[PDB]
Design an enzyme around this catalytic site. Structure first.
Site, PDB file in Angstrom:
ATOM      1  N   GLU A  18       4.671 -20.636  -1.619  1.00  0.00           N
ATOM      2  CA  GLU A  18       5.653 -21.548  -2.199  1.00  0.00           C
ATOM      3  C   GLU A  18       6.922 -20.789  -2.566  1.00  0.00           C
ATOM      4  O   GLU A  18       7.489 -20.847  -3.679  1.00  0.00           O
ATOM      5  CB  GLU A  18       5.055 -22.223  -3.449  1.00  0.00           C
ATOM      6  N   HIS A  44       0.366 -18.713  -9.248  1.00  0.00           N
ATOM      7  CA  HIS A  44       1.816 -18.549  -9.240  1.00  0.00           C
ATOM      8  C   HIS A  44       2.093 -17.438 -10.224  1.00  0.00           C
ATOM      9  O   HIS A  44       2.228 -17.635 -11.391  1.00  0.00           O
ATOM     10  CB  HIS A  44       2.630 -19.781  -9.581  1.00  0.00           C
ATOM     11  N   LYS A  53      12.918 -27.252  -5.542  1.00  0.00           N
ATOM     12  CA  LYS A  53      13.664 -27.137  -6.781  1.00  0.00           C
ATOM     13  C   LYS A  53      14.554 -25.881  -6.810  1.00  0.00           C
ATOM     14  O   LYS A  53      15.467 -25.784  -7.648  1.00  0.00           O
ATOM     15  CB  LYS A  53      12.733 -27.067  -8.001  1.00  0.00           C
TER      16      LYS A  53
HETATM   17  C1  LIG Z   1       9.062 -22.082  -9.888  1.00  0.00           C
HETATM   18  C2  LIG Z   1       7.961 -22.303  -8.677  1.00  0.00           C
HETATM   19  C3  LIG Z   1       7.970 -21.755  -7.316  1.00  0.00           C
HETATM   20  C4  LIG Z   1       9.127 -20.894  -6.758  1.00  0.00           C
HETATM   21  O1  LIG Z   1       9.436 -19.816  -7.654  1.00  0.00           O
HETATM   22  P1  LIG Z   1      10.178 -18.498  -6.973  1.00  0.00           P
HETATM   23  O2  LIG Z   1      10.282 -17.374  -7.922  1.00  0.00           O
HETATM   24  O3  LIG Z   1      11.536 -19.132  -6.653  1.00  0.00           O
HETATM   25  O4  LIG Z   1       9.651 -18.156  -5.595  1.00  0.00           O
HETATM   26  C5  LIG Z   1       6.927 -21.957  -6.493  1.00  0.00           C
HETATM   27  N1  LIG Z   1       5.848 -22.681  -6.860  1.00  0.00           N
HETATM   28  C6  LIG Z   1       5.754 -23.244  -8.115  1.00  0.00           C
HETATM   29  C7  LIG Z   1       4.522 -24.059  -8.378  1.00  0.00           C
HETATM   30  C8  LIG Z   1       6.804 -23.060  -9.057  1.00  0.00           C
HETATM   31  O5  LIG Z   1       6.853 -23.566 -10.404  1.00  0.00           O
END
Ligand SMILES: *Cc1c(COP(=O)(O)O)cnc(C)c1O
Ligand SMILES: *Cc1c(COP(=O)(O)O)cnc(C)c1O
Lengths: 356, 356
Positions: free
Chosen positions: B232, B155, B35
């Site tokens: 991630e 996260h 995304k």
């Molecule tokens: C939004 C998101 C990410 C990536 O966020 P970053 O700040 O771009 O690294 C990773 N994992 C989950 C589950 C997310 O919602």
């Protein structure tokens, strides 16, 4: 399976809207603001009722030319146009543009020199609109550039709480109209812009607004065969014509008892309107209310992985089940037109009805 | 003519970022968060450096399968999935999903019963993540449903000011890990999420974060051939790879002297990041600085007909001319992925370079 979200659009609602327009603002020819909602059936229905179109870019110019609305029914009402987009409008027959400053006029002189230019006055924005203090200088500069300035327009903005603003704007329009004539310009168009309510139970109803407009109009702009009054209603025509049905794809219980409902459209999609349009939304369960029902504080969340993608913070709902449907009414305006496919999600198909 | 806006994307910046990841976080296999930015060249470059992919919908699952990334390099890391999207992931070989509540596990039991489920703990959000208080009950319910729970994830969220959060999160992951094992589950995956900086001059640098993570890792999750650590990272890989050049299509002067610049992309387009990502942007003129130059307070505004479509409120710029170019650096992340074609405007073409 795949209970995908979908809109029902009621084209008849668009007809009824037009009917009321005509009855409450008979002096005024509507140029629909296509950025509001440019669904092909909504465009064709409005074209068929004999609406004008207010377009803001080459794309919107193509789309309405696409359905065989001739050029004369289009006002290109964007004061700050990319020079190639002007070129396009000049090549498609579109000759009435607006402007709010002299820099644009210089563009226009060099790219579309016989265009009919409408002067837009602040009212709405720091972003758009000449202050009335600056119009004389603006109009003298217009003269050196040999611009055909043919009228005045303003845009109260999409949520007035008092109708007086229209009346104020119209008076102001008379002043700049008069400088127009004084300096030799053929001024004969008054465009009173957009901002009317598109839900027939807003706080400030369409009808009050139509009445203040009409009184202002009669006082400053008496009927004349040389004068045409025009507007650029956007949400007026479409807000309440579209209803969204969204499937509850996911469910959370907090033990007081509260629920979190996850649905399959959200603020990157049809509810972008919460971020860009100041929209507030009311989730209606499509199951009919059951007598005595228990109701609990609920949030409903859109499908995306983002914590800010939230549709409702605390709204009383019956206990909902994965696979059931929430309805959001009045989701005609600034809704499909802002959607993105952030995160993979795809936007709601539209289904059409004719309220006969 | 038509000075359209365009991105230059530097795929070598992606490779450099990967090189650093590997040097500072060697125990950790990155699943890129698609995304963030799902441009086909950025996917293919990451797929070639041997990244995994974090996907959030059937569309993101298709896209990365489309480039011949096998299923096993995919984590479907969306806790709240539409049941038919689960079905899809089951039909595409994608078996590792996450979840944060028992309701989802009921879905998963009914739709994808042999799935490797990763339990995500709050850290980020009211929207996602199981509180650590609730994991035992959650895990007992998983057992009743016969869920194959195989790890923990969290996260921290995309802008921490202290790296301790990761350390806090990792500790907490050890606790739920240990309940996992206690109750008979084969726990061997720790996913430490996303949130790292993607511009190598943020206030809290990647390297501090890699140091706190590694300390936390060695203290709570000693190397073991049975354990895999995963992440991630989203903006990490792409933030600074993309540069936006935008044409000033329109100019306003206020007499003190201030300027208004209108450019041909804006908050319905690549700058949606101002609204949805908390982005602040710095407009750089692409003409090289001329010695002594006069600089004035300026706003720059996006092409759209909305007063809220504003990019910059007061930034010092040389006097600019219609037809010149503003560059915005660091526009890799949450920029193309949020765009809409509100008002007729179309989004920047992307051009690709390889910093060799
Ligand atoms: C939004 C998101 C990410 C990536 O966020 P970053 O700040 O771009 O690294 C990773 N994992 C989950 C589950 C997310 O919602
Ligand atoms: C935004 C806009 C409209 C339509 O606004 P509504 O509130 O939908 O009626 C009309 N004219 C101009 C110049 C606009 O920016």
């Amino acid at each position: 399976d795949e209970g995908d979200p979908f809109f029902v659009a009621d084209l008849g609602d668009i007809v009824r809207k037009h009917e009321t327009w005509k009855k409450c603002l008979p002096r005024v020819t509507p140029f629909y603001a296509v950025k509001c909602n440019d669904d092909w059936r909504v465009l064709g229905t409005l074209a068929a009722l004999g609406t004008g179109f207010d377009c803001a870019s080459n794309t919107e110019i193509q789309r309405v030319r696409g359905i065989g609305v001739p050029p004369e029914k289009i006002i290109y009402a964007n004061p700050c146009k990319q020079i190639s987009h002007i070129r396009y409008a000049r090549d498609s027959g579109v000759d009435v543009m607006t402007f709010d400053c002299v820099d644009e006029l210089e563009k226009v002189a060099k790219t579309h020199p016989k265009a009919k230019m409408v002067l837009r006055i602040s009212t709405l924005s720091v972003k758009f609109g000449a202050k009335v203090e600056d119009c004389r200088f603006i109009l003298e500069q217009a003269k050196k550039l040999n611009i055909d300035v043919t009228g005045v327009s303003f845009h109260v903005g999409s949520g007035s709480t008092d109708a007086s603003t229209f009346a104020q704007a119209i008076s102001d329009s008379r002043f700049v109209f008069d400088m127009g004539t004084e300096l030799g310009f053929n001024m004969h168009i008054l465009d009173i812009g957009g901002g009317f309510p598109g839900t027939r139970d807003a706080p400030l109803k369409f009808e009050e607004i139509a009445g203040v407009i009409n009184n202002a109009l009669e006082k400053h702009f008496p009927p004349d065969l040389k004068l045409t009054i025009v507007a650029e209603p956007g949400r007026y025509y479409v807000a309440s014509a579209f209803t969204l049905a969204v499937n509850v794809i996911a469910k959370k219980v907090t033990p007081a008892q509260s629920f979190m409902y996850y649905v399959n459209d959200g603020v990157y999609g049809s509810f972008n309107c919460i971020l860009y349009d100041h929209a507030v939304v009311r989730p209606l369960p499509q199951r009919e209310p059951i007598p005595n029902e228990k109701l609990y504080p609920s949030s409903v969340w859109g499908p995306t992985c983002d914590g800010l993608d939230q549709i409702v913070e605390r709204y009383y709902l019956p206990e909902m089940q994965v696979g059931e449907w929430l309805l959001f009414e009045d989701m005609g305006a600034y809704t499909v037109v802002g959607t993105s496919s952030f995160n993979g999600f795809q936007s709601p198909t539209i289904y059409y009805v004719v309220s006969g």
